[PDB]
């Protein structure tokens, strides 16, 4: 596509999300940057209302598909790259077993140079003591990887995967992800065959750091389309 043209570099992120959970006002605010060169993105993320009222591992998946590394072989199944640089909403339902959901939307576009995930997210019916309002998830997160699937009807794509949450007791919190995509422009986009990502997240601190933050490494690699 077109919009490949964009990521041949090294692409400046902003990331902002205004969340409500369970009527707990809080935001967030994300910079740093990504290559889908190799698939790489690194951000800081702080949250600017004092102390995150969830736990940081999950908002991850909420916290750029474009920046995932495509093979040679498989760019003509890129979406995401395609809708740049007008860009695509990116919409999700995540269900924590056991316990409320998140609703997320998300814009993610070029503002000039730098590429931006503004989102809104709304959870409900979170329990009191539960493992997301009670911070009982461990700071970590497990490699994972995510179908995708074309959704020609809306000329976007579609995906469903689970999240495996490591609890502290050593149980698993699943957080099941319905996510949808639809391109923002109407220019021609890449409606992929099937194929998933494969996504590796390092969670980290910065040690001089007071706020509540997350500094966050991610791989995100495009598979399952032989040559």
Known sequence: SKGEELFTGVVPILVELDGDVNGHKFSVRGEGEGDATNGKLTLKFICTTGKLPVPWPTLVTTLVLCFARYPDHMKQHDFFKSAMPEGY????????????????????????????????????????????????????????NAYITADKQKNGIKSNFKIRHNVEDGSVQLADHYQQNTPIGDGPVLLPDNHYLSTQNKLSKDPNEKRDHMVLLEFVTAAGITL
Do not use: P
């Open 89 to 144: 909403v990116q919409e999700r339902t995540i269900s924590f077993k056991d316990d409320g959901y998140y609703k997320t939307r998300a814009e993610v576009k070029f503002e000039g140079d730098t590429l931006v995930n503004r989102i809104e997210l709304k959870g409900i019916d979170f329990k009191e003591d539960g493992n997301i309002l009670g911070h009982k998830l461990e700071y970590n997160f497990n490699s994972h």
